[PDB]
Amino acid sequence: TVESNWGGAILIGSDFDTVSATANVPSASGGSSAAGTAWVGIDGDTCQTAILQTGFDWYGDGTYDAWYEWEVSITISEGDSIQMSVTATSDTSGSATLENLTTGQKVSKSFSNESSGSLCRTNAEFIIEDFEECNSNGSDCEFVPFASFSPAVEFTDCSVTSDGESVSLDDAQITQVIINNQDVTDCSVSGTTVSCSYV
Numbered sequence: 532t533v534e535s536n537w538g539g540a541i542l543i544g545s546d547f548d549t550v551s552a553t554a555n556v557p558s559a560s561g562g563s564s565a566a567g568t569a570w571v572g573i574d575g576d577t578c579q580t581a582i583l584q585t586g587f588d589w590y591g592d593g594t595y596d597a598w599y600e601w602e603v604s605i606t607i608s609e610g611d612s613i614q615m616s617v618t619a620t621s622d623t624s625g626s627a628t629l630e631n632l633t634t635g636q637k638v639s640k641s642f643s644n645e646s647s648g649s650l651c652r653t654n655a656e657f658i659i660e661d662f663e664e665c666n667s668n669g670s671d672c673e674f675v676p677f678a679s680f681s682p683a684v685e686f687t688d689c690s691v692t693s694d695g696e697s698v699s700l701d702d703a704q705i706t707q708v709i710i711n712n713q714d715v716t717d718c719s720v721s722g723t724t725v726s727c728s729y730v
């Protein structure tokens with residue numbers, strides 16, 4: 532039973548502009564079906580109408596993948612350093628960028644006139660998640676088995692902007708992934724770093 536599927540730091544506020552950080556790609560285990568994801572994003576917490584996010588997933592069979600969302604895809608390998616960023620120019624327009632830094636590859640997507648859902652620009656976050664896999668229309672969504680990973684996934688040089696001004700993580704709320712009533716992550720903040728160890 533997955534009781535909490537998000538681990539990491541969440542800032543609450545208004546007019547959030549850009550959210551970005553660099554994260555290392557960990558080694559993962561637990562089987563081909565086990566997985567995990569690290570991403571940066573805007574909204575999705577108190578603002579449940581939309582979510583602008585981008586990041587990458589790791590699977591227990593040693594494979595990886597990158598994605599953005601308001602579509603998958605860059606080649607990702609254990610140890611790579613990935614710079615992730617999202618920008619909300621408005622409640623209905625923005626962009627998502629993912630750059631491997633280690634391989635020199637970079638991908639980006641611009642969004643506009645999004646009708647699927649609008650942003651409030653009130654939540655900024657750096658998250659490690661036990662994501663869901665859905666199918667059969669949408670009548671069946673299940674959390675993927677949570678993969679073990681190492682070393683710790685660290686979001687470094689975290690940056691959050693509001694109305695053009697910087698916002699420290701000083702007052703960010705902290706959450707942990709919790710499965711079968713046990714913390715499976717130990718995410719903590721310090722300076723401009725959000726560090727999440729697997730437990």
Ligand SMILES: N[C@@H](Cc1ccc(O)cc1)C(=O)O
Pocket residue numbers: 535536537575576663706
């Ligand atoms: N994962 C939840 C959404 C969620 C949003 C924010 C959280 O802090 C935790 C969970 C769902 O599938 O509906």
